[PDB]
Amino acid sequence: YCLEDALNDLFIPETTIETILKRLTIKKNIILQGPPGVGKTFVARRLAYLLTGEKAPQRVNMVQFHQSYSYEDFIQGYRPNGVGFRRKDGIFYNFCQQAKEQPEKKYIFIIDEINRANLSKVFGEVMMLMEHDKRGENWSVPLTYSENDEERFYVPENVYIIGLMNTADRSLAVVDYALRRRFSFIDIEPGFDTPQFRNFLLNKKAEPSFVESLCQKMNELNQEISKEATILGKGFRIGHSYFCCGLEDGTSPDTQWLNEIVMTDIAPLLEEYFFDDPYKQQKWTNKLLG
Amino acid sequence: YCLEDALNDLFIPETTIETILKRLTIKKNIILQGPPGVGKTFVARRLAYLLTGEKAPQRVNMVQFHQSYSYEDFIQGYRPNGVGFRRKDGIFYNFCQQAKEQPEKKYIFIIDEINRANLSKVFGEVMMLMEHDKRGENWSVPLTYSENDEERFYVPENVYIIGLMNTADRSLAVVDYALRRRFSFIDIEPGFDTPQFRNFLLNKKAEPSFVESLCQKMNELNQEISKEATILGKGFRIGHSYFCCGLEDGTSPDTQWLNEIVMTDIAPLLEEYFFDDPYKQQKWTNKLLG
Amino acid sequence: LNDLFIPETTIETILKRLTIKKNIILQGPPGVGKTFVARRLAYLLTGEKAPQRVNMVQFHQSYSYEDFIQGYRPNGVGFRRKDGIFYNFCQQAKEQPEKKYIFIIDEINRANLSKVFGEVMMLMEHDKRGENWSVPLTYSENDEERFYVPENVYIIGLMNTADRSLAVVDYALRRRFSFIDIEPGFDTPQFRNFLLNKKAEPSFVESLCQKMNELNQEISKEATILGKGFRIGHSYFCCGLEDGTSPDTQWLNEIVMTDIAPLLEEYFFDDPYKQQKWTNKLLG
Amino acid sequence: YCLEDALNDLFIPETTIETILKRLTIKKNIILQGPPGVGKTFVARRLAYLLTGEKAPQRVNMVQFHQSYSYEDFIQGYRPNGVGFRRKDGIFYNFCQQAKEQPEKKYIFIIDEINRANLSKVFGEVMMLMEHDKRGENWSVPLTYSENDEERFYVPENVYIIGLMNTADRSLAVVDYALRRRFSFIDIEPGFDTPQFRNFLLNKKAEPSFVESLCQKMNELNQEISKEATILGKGFRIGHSYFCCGLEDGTSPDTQWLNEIVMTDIAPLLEEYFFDDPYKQQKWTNKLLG
Amino acid sequence: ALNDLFIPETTIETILKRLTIKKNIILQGPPGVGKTFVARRLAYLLTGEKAPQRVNMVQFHQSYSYEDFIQGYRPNGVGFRRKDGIFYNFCQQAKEQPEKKYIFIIDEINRANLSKVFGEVMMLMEHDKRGENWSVPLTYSENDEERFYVPENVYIIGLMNTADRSLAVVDYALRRRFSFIDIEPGFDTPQFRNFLLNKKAEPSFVESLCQKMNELNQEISKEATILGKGFRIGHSYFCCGLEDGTSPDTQWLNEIVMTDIAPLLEEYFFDDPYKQQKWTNKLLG
Amino acid sequence: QPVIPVRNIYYMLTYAWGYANLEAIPGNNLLDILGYVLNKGVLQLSRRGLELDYNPNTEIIPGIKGRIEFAKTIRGFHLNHGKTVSTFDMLNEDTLANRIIKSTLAILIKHEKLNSTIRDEARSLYRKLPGISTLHLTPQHFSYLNGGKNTRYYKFVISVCKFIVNNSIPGQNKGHYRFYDFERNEKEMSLLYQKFLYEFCRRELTSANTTRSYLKWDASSISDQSLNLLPRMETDITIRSSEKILIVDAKYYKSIFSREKFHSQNLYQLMNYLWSLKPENGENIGGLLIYPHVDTAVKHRYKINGFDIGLCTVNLGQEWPCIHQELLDIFDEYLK
Ligand SMILES: Nc1nc2c(ncn2[C@@H]2O[C@H](COP(=O)(O)OP(=O)(O)NP(=O)(O)O)[C@@H](O)[C@H]2O)c(=O)[nH]1
Ligand SMILES: Nc1nc2c(ncn2[C@@H]2O[C@H](COP(=O)(O)OP(=O)(O)NP(=O)(O)O)[C@@H](O)[C@H]2O)c(=O)[nH]1
Ligand SMILES: Nc1nc2c(ncn2[C@@H]2O[C@H](COP(=O)(O)OP(=O)(O)NP(=O)(O)O)[C@@H](O)[C@H]2O)c(=O)[nH]1
Ligand SMILES: Nc1nc2c(ncn2[C@@H]2O[C@H](COP(=O)(O)OP(=O)(O)O)[C@@H](O)[C@H]2O)c(=O)[nH]1
Ligand SMILES: Nc1nc2c(ncn2[C@@H]2O[C@H](COP(=O)(O)OP(=O)(O)O)[C@@H](O)[C@H]2O)c(=O)[nH]1
Ligand SMILES: [Mg+2]
Ligand SMILES: [Mg+2]
Ligand SMILES: [Mg+2]
């Protein structure tokens, strides 16, 4: 496996893709922040195979934080056995043991919607330990529910952590600045202007005018979205996922199909987005339609 | 089962219905939004047997969410058998296993008043999984309470999801735009000015003159409701159900019958819609009677 | 049908509305006999004075879905799933389909009504009653085990209109419930006949109605602040004269200070003179 | 354990560490109060070995506090057997007993992220003993979980307690009452305008002007943050460790290396800081690149 | 006892008129009014037998709950048992004796949430719904063999205090079922004046103090919002220390000014020490 | 000692906050105006329904609710007395956003100088929110609310509470409040003036693009590249269009209200902004000084140093639409 394999279908420029690996290899923990529908989930499984250099799932682990995950779930907690409780090693603790089984091959842990959960609660002791410098046996620390006999948990160097925080929900945004120092934050743009997106449509039986018209209108809209910061900030700007899918059957892209998209998905979003004047809603919808 | 069985009593146009099944076959997640009393609950049981094409309720699961509902109830959680606690596979988890047994047949899960409960907390792990392109074992994920990483949950492809949310309360709305992306939102309207609504009345010995007077009146009133979107959106407008039920005995819909219900139901509703304006209450109420 | 102070037409509306619609909200100020009305009325619908069929509860903010329908709660040995009253009650009525079983909910406004009802907020409607409309419950161990409202069940809601909470408005529940206002009924003869058959003076009864109406009308003057829902009920007068003390001006004077005076403070808060004025108006 | 190994690399002035060493022998309960990335965790591991004069793990203990951390794990409590509950000596109890053996040798206990958990919930009764004056067997007390009054615990004088607290969160504005009486707060500067931080870069093949140019802006920026009190206090200002890391290869510092840090770490942080004025983000981000 | 009580007899007579009929009652008044001591003598008065066994007293707090009040499960040596609470035990004691009036004292009732505590029973204590007809099975009553009903004999008294400005409007639950009563400090009353003149107090010393406190009681209630009528000082501080064996004197009062009224005076205003000092100095002489 | 009529100022605040009938209210003073909207605004919200945020609750209860935390239960041995430590998400209105409104209503009622009707109606609403907890308001509370998760409507009414809280002064009584004499201070009035225009220009001048531009000196100094000592320069507004660029410097002065000598020191700032700014398009460069006057509006144009500069005024107190007319009329002249 190689970059050529991954970047065949991805709409992202190579520019970020190398920047991603650059920050990762030095820092070992990063976050990709972007609105939904920009392939955040999409890239993540592909990224994992690059660094290992092979398409292996075993060295990779994927999860989602749902605002109910806990340290007891992630790391160490007490679970009922048949009649009485027992201590259960969590998944991350289970994962790190696998990673240190062989240090040579890199191990990746993938967390969707990380911003939801209270990360300080879940990770706890690990929030220090995850950082690149403070890894290995030198910085071994004993866990909360560890046995009285000294047993310590240390992050292996090979481990890499990836976080996936959407930029829509403002409330669910990272205000743990202590935690935000462990991570490096990579903004991802919608991907409209890129040719690699455009080629994907043109290869799929599309007119260059209709394609080039589409990107022109969306880019106008996201500027207007980007214009405001009071309610609708830059991050809210629309993703490209809507347009990506649904053409597998052979349906060529046209105003009929585009019209179905606008009425069905975007038009609800807009009225939900603005909720001040329909004219703005009527304006931009008709602009896309016309 | 057959399509025409449902459409006989249905006031909504087929055009909307055809739009609906087209999306649902594609998206596998949908949300139906309208005021109360427009048959969201009514259509949904009908619609499932259409999509399957056969009237199998065992393949259908119907639930109403509310505040006292969680991931522990829905998906997985530890609950008391008795002296000893056990891991209890939630209802949705059980439903998904059933669909796996028969991959060919479509299995449908119906959520009434979805917008009430905190979907962000309830779906969680599912919030990523449910999307149309991410279903299958390739995207299998271990849960919070899974014993090990190997125990993983993947949504079957056959499953279709239905979301039912009233538009009366802006308080309870799906503001999570990420959650909005998974669901395809199809508005439903009261549909007074429809033949099938009128045919139902005339079939029950109703005056065509009274009917045309009736539909025109509400159409104007509902349009008045949609006007003040700042105050009350189009989603607030009155449904057709108030007039629908109550004639089962065979009572003819005279003007007196309508005058009785208006006083009993819509009148206090009108009072609430116009807290500040008594004349506006008096205006429209008196408008109906003459 | 004899001692009721509410119009005969109003009760006739209710029985027709109730049997058809199966759900109602009876909203009015305190002291209008909401409890006695429904309890009197409930025996009419059954046709027999059966209290076992009838069950009443008074909701409160802490009341929860745990209490009403289902919930996990402790036995002596440990925790188990405990069927709340309504699940217990509906099963009892389901046992006997023919007879009409009733469920009464007082001070309904206090609780988050959506929260309490939960699943049945859909099921309670008359059409969606039966095995077809059954659903597995939130805490149901198995998907196959479901709960459905029987047709015989009829539901009554009693609402105090003087404590509006600008927290939650549900217009969907309003679709389930047919709202019926209740006036105090001072003008009604049945209220007057009760007192004149209790050795009241003819003028004394007539004087009271004039006194109360002038006050009640002022309450409904400013619909924004207060309404007809706020105005005073009559029931305070019913109690306390069956000992054998017939009405007198002194007895009136007691109730004004005893009961109504805090209400005035509650209503006409930070305006003592209006309280003193309206208080003194009645005494004269 | 020579100071030269300890103090040469450090960016902090030798004055403040000496001042820290004074109070630490004096009071033995100390808190380092500064934003993340200034080496609070970094110094403390060295500081313990300074006082002892040796690199000894046994005499020095490190922990990070979080919400799950509690008295029963920290001090003493009951852990389930298969059914039964067994008492277990907690860390601090086990840790002090080592210190009881060797009164002359200094013992060190390091608590990072202390504010996250309430001290009373964890420490509780022992806060009486923990204070510097009321130490030694004279003040011995029987524990909450002691089987009998005979068994008693007293904090020996030799142990010193270190607390690492970050002034990066809004909740910490209302500092806990438990801490203030018993601990001595010390502020850690960002330490940009220091010789050793500069000299660290100069040894790593850095131009002086590019180094000196950077510090004024960083010194300028942190000054702007500290001027605010409502949203961002002085304690929120940037630390000096973003720039430290990432040079392990030997790659020379330059605008290329620096620009990576700005966009990937500091740029989105500023969005969180200057949400209200996005243009203010543009002001600084453009300023730093220039 | 009436002569020993300092409050107007009309209020004493009025209360017995209300409670007998209403069966639920709450007293709101200043601290230092002998509200507890008031009710006990009144409790003995209504029963007529001066029986403490019939009488049971409870003081509420924010933690107080249904398990404390009514019923709950408490640990055994092994396992756990259903454990009868106070009110469950108390009424069943009263159930045997229907004729005999039984009284319940709830101190500092406003602090706790009545609903959370009472729960189901909160309606059953309403006088209209009493006896076996309104019987309900309890939350923890696993079987339907026994249902809990408050019999008619029960009377419930609640002691609330108007001391605190932090207190917001009373809970709606309370207002419905209870008749709210304001108790005067009773300085003006002769029965309190005869409680000092019986101790060989000077009539000038007696009368002056009545005027002195009244001057304050007007000023403390003169404040519109922050300090109302309910705030004004009660007499209980004056009782304790005179009939123990030490005669009244201005110096005895002088200590009392510093002891209770002076900090209380600081507490009410909490703004102006001079306004406190002016009043404290005014009290002393 | 003249100032603008108080009603019109509210319109300027609205544009300043970026988002009704004031003819009905008879109270000339500001606080009658502001409270009436707040008192009415909450009523508008309550009609639709107030915000309810899922608040997690972890407590000791007699049963299973939501998710039981096994650890806290066993450590506390709550099983023995039939209790569990369980987490669940009760849905309340007691959030910070709602708490701010309610505590503010106490301040509004407590204000010494206020219309009787406004005080009475608010006291009703204060009672109408029993569940919510009163709080002691600070900007730090408002600071936390910069997330703005609530609706656009909430964010408007919240901004009102910010104005009241900061512009509330205790008066005769220790408890009660007294409103700030906002009009008298020029500085906040100027910041009102500048902020009013910037958001206003985005609304009406859709034709042009409106952005604030930071400027950098043309200077080079051997001593420091930083030039920290030099004054920081940030435009009040720049309103760029294809045909012409235009910078405006506007400030609120008391002297100009008098119809004599003229106070135009801000012009000194303006010229150097023109110099340090260099346009790539090079279409033209124009400047404008606009001030508030009471009586009448006067416009002049000047050609000073190769720059086209305008001095203009507005007759505030006339009428808001005609004022709205006048401002758009003004820019049309210069934007050319
Ligand atoms: N073929 C192709 N599909 C893409 C590309 N980028 C995004 N998509 C598609 O857009 C859809 C959603 O992508 P996803 O990764 O889940 O976006 P997300 O940010 O993770 N979603 P969310 O923020 O809601 O969690 C998928 O169909 C995904 O394949 C791309 O570059 N190529
Ligand atoms: N006979 C008949 N009844 C209909 C039709 N459409 C809606 N109704 C009736 O209207 C009532 C409510 O249906 P429902 O789906 O619950 O409306 P809703 O939008 O879901 N209401 P809510 O959202 O509040 O739950 C029922 O009486 C239903 O049968 C229809 O086409 N034919
Ligand atoms: N060489 C050198 N590195 C330093 C210096 N100060 C901090 N660092 C580096 O900064 C990184 C993090 O330091 P750290 O102590 O963890 O900061 P912190 O205060 O603990 N972070 P937090 O407050 O979030 O817990 C490490 O690489 C550390 O060595 C210093 O003075 N010299
Ligand atoms: N005879 C008669 N008694 C009534 C009437 N209305 C109420 N009462 C009595 O008033 C007493 C209290 O009624 P209650 O239900 O508590 O008042 P509400 O709940 O606020 O409406 C009971 O004795 C009622 O029966 C009535 O219309 N006629
Ligand atoms: N003898 C007598 N003592 C009274 C009277 N009123 C109050 N007291 C005394 O005042 C004390 C009780 O006061 P109280 O307010 O209940 O104390 P609190 O509950 O802490 O506020 C006891 O000494 C009572 O006997 C009274 O009228 N006569
Ligand atoms: Mg995704
Ligand atoms: Mg429905
Ligand atoms: Mg650290």
PDB file of N, CA and C in Angstrom, chain C residues 199-235:
ATOM      1  N   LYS C 199     -80.837  27.299  54.831  1.00  0.00           N
ATOM      2  CA  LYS C 199     -81.346  28.369  55.685  1.00  0.00           C
ATOM      3  C   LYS C 199     -80.524  29.646  55.542  1.00  0.00           C
ATOM      4  N   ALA C 200     -80.128  29.951  54.311  1.00  0.00           N
ATOM      5  CA  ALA C 200     -79.535  31.238  53.991  1.00  0.00           C
ATOM      6  C   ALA C 200     -80.624  32.269  53.726  1.00  0.00           C
ATOM      7  N   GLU C 201     -80.248  33.539  53.828  1.00  0.00           N
ATOM      8  CA  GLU C 201     -81.174  34.595  53.450  1.00  0.00           C
ATOM      9  C   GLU C 201     -81.237  34.677  51.925  1.00  0.00           C
ATOM     10  N   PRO C 202     -82.401  34.987  51.343  1.00  0.00           N
ATOM     11  CA  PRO C 202     -82.442  35.123  49.879  1.00  0.00           C
ATOM     12  C   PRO C 202     -81.530  36.214  49.361  1.00  0.00           C
ATOM     13  N   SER C 203     -81.484  37.348  50.058  1.00  0.00           N
ATOM     14  CA  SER C 203     -80.634  38.447  49.622  1.00  0.00           C
ATOM     15  C   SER C 203     -79.168  38.113  49.843  1.00  0.00           C
ATOM     16  N   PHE C 204     -78.872  37.396  50.928  1.00  0.00           N
ATOM     17  CA  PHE C 204     -77.493  37.101  51.290  1.00  0.00           C
ATOM     18  C   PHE C 204     -76.820  36.303  50.184  1.00  0.00           C
ATOM     19  N   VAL C 205     -77.542  35.336  49.616  1.00  0.00           N
ATOM     20  CA  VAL C 205     -77.041  34.612  48.453  1.00  0.00           C
ATOM     21  C   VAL C 205     -76.916  35.554  47.267  1.00  0.00           C
ATOM     22  N   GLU C 206     -77.951  36.358  47.028  1.00  0.00           N
ATOM     23  CA  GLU C 206     -77.935  37.283  45.901  1.00  0.00           C
ATOM     24  C   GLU C 206     -76.847  38.329  46.078  1.00  0.00           C
ATOM     25  N   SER C 207     -76.603  38.735  47.320  1.00  0.00           N
ATOM     26  CA  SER C 207     -75.570  39.720  47.589  1.00  0.00           C
ATOM     27  C   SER C 207     -74.194  39.153  47.284  1.00  0.00           C
ATOM     28  N   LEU C 208     -73.990  37.876  47.598  1.00  0.00           N
ATOM     29  CA  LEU C 208     -72.686  37.257  47.410  1.00  0.00           C
ATOM     30  C   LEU C 208     -72.318  37.189  45.935  1.00  0.00           C
ATOM     31  N   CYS C 209     -73.262  36.752  45.097  1.00  0.00           N
ATOM     32  CA  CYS C 209     -72.994  36.619  43.669  1.00  0.00           C
ATOM     33  C   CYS C 209     -72.578  37.949  43.068  1.00  0.00           C
ATOM     34  N   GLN C 210     -73.229  39.029  43.487  1.00  0.00           N
ATOM     35  CA  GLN C 210     -72.814  40.352  43.045  1.00  0.00           C
ATOM     36  C   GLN C 210     -71.399  40.650  43.508  1.00  0.00           C
ATOM     37  N   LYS C 211     -71.093  40.307  44.757  1.00  0.00           N
ATOM     38  CA  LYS C 211     -69.775  40.592  45.313  1.00  0.00           C
ATOM     39  C   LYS C 211     -68.695  39.802  44.586  1.00  0.00           C
ATOM     40  N   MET C 212     -68.925  38.504  44.382  1.00  0.00           N
ATOM     41  CA  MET C 212     -67.904  37.673  43.761  1.00  0.00           C
ATOM     42  C   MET C 212     -67.715  38.038  42.300  1.00  0.00           C
ATOM     43  N   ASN C 213     -68.814  38.313  41.598  1.00  0.00           N
ATOM     44  CA  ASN C 213     -68.730  38.586  40.170  1.00  0.00           C
ATOM     45  C   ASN C 213     -67.918  39.839  39.890  1.00  0.00           C
ATOM     46  N   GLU C 214     -68.123  40.890  40.682  1.00  0.00           N
ATOM     47  CA  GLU C 214     -67.352  42.113  40.494  1.00  0.00           C
ATOM     48  C   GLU C 214     -65.864  41.849  40.669  1.00  0.00           C
ATOM     49  N   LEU C 215     -65.510  41.018  41.647  1.00  0.00           N
ATOM     50  CA  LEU C 215     -64.116  40.641  41.830  1.00  0.00           C
ATOM     51  C   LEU C 215     -63.633  39.745  40.704  1.00  0.00           C
ATOM     52  N   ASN C 216     -64.433  38.745  40.342  1.00  0.00           N
ATOM     53  CA  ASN C 216     -64.007  37.777  39.340  1.00  0.00           C
ATOM     54  C   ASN C 216     -63.818  38.442  37.987  1.00  0.00           C
ATOM     55  N   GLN C 217     -64.709  39.370  37.647  1.00  0.00           N
ATOM     56  CA  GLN C 217     -64.618  40.065  36.371  1.00  0.00           C
ATOM     57  C   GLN C 217     -63.361  40.914  36.294  1.00  0.00           C
ATOM     58  N   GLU C 218     -62.973  41.523  37.413  1.00  0.00           N
ATOM     59  CA  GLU C 218     -61.746  42.307  37.434  1.00  0.00           C
ATOM     60  C   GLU C 218     -60.540  41.411  37.178  1.00  0.00           C
ATOM     61  N   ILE C 219     -60.582  40.177  37.686  1.00  0.00           N
ATOM     62  CA  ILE C 219     -59.472  39.250  37.502  1.00  0.00           C
ATOM     63  C   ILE C 219     -59.312  38.928  36.030  1.00  0.00           C
ATOM     64  N   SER C 220     -60.424  38.721  35.342  1.00  0.00           N
ATOM     65  CA  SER C 220     -60.405  38.444  33.919  1.00  0.00           C
ATOM     66  C   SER C 220     -60.236  39.700  33.083  1.00  0.00           C
ATOM     67  N   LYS C 221     -60.120  40.872  33.714  1.00  0.00           N
ATOM     68  CA  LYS C 221     -60.003  42.103  32.948  1.00  0.00           C
ATOM     69  C   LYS C 221     -58.697  42.116  32.171  1.00  0.00           C
ATOM     70  N   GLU C 222     -57.602  41.764  32.836  1.00  0.00           N
ATOM     71  CA  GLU C 222     -56.268  41.776  32.240  1.00  0.00           C
ATOM     72  C   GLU C 222     -55.902  40.334  31.916  1.00  0.00           C
ATOM     73  N   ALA C 223     -56.203  39.925  30.680  1.00  0.00           N
ATOM     74  CA  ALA C 223     -56.013  38.534  30.282  1.00  0.00           C
ATOM     75  C   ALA C 223     -54.549  38.127  30.366  1.00  0.00           C
ATOM     76  N   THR C 224     -53.639  39.077  30.152  1.00  0.00           N
ATOM     77  CA  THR C 224     -52.213  38.771  30.130  1.00  0.00           C
ATOM     78  C   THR C 224     -51.736  38.334  31.503  1.00  0.00           C
ATOM     79  N   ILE C 225     -52.054  39.127  32.521  1.00  0.00           N
ATOM     80  CA  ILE C 225     -51.576  38.860  33.870  1.00  0.00           C
ATOM     81  C   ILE C 225     -52.338  37.693  34.472  1.00  0.00           C
ATOM     82  N   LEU C 226     -53.659  37.760  34.403  1.00  0.00           N
ATOM     83  CA  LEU C 226     -54.565  36.810  35.020  1.00  0.00           C
ATOM     84  C   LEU C 226     -55.633  36.470  34.000  1.00  0.00           C
ATOM     85  N   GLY C 227     -56.476  35.504  34.332  1.00  0.00           N
ATOM     86  CA  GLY C 227     -57.579  35.200  33.452  1.00  0.00           C
ATOM     87  C   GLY C 227     -58.776  34.662  34.192  1.00  0.00           C
ATOM     88  N   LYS C 228     -59.760  34.188  33.431  1.00  0.00           N
ATOM     89  CA  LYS C 228     -60.863  33.445  34.024  1.00  0.00           C
ATOM     90  C   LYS C 228     -60.357  32.195  34.721  1.00  0.00           C
ATOM     91  N   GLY C 229     -59.225  31.661  34.271  1.00  0.00           N
ATOM     92  CA  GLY C 229     -58.639  30.528  34.949  1.00  0.00           C
ATOM     93  C   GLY C 229     -58.169  30.883  36.341  1.00  0.00           C
ATOM     94  N   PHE C 230     -57.799  32.148  36.561  1.00  0.00           N
ATOM     95  CA  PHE C 230     -57.308  32.568  37.869  1.00  0.00           C
ATOM     96  C   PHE C 230     -58.428  32.824  38.869  1.00  0.00           C
ATOM     97  N   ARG C 231     -59.591  33.281  38.401  1.00  0.00           N
ATOM     98  CA  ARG C 231     -60.658  33.764  39.274  1.00  0.00           C
ATOM     99  C   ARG C 231     -61.068  32.741  40.323  1.00  0.00           C
ATOM    100  N   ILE C 232     -61.718  33.213  41.381  1.00  0.00           N
ATOM    101  CA  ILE C 232     -61.916  32.402  42.572  1.00  0.00           C
ATOM    102  C   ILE C 232     -62.989  31.348  42.335  1.00  0.00           C
ATOM    103  N   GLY C 233     -62.760  30.151  42.890  1.00  0.00           N
ATOM    104  CA  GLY C 233     -63.749  29.094  42.886  1.00  0.00           C
ATOM    105  C   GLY C 233     -64.694  29.189  44.073  1.00  0.00           C
ATOM    106  N   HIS C 234     -65.739  28.363  44.033  1.00  0.00           N
ATOM    107  CA  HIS C 234     -66.802  28.414  45.029  1.00  0.00           C
ATOM    108  C   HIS C 234     -66.633  27.439  46.183  1.00  0.00           C
ATOM    109  N   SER C 235     -65.839  26.382  46.001  1.00  0.00           N
ATOM    110  CA  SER C 235     -65.905  25.213  46.877  1.00  0.00           C
ATOM    111  C   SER C 235     -65.632  25.540  48.335  1.00  0.00           C
TER     112      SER C 235
END
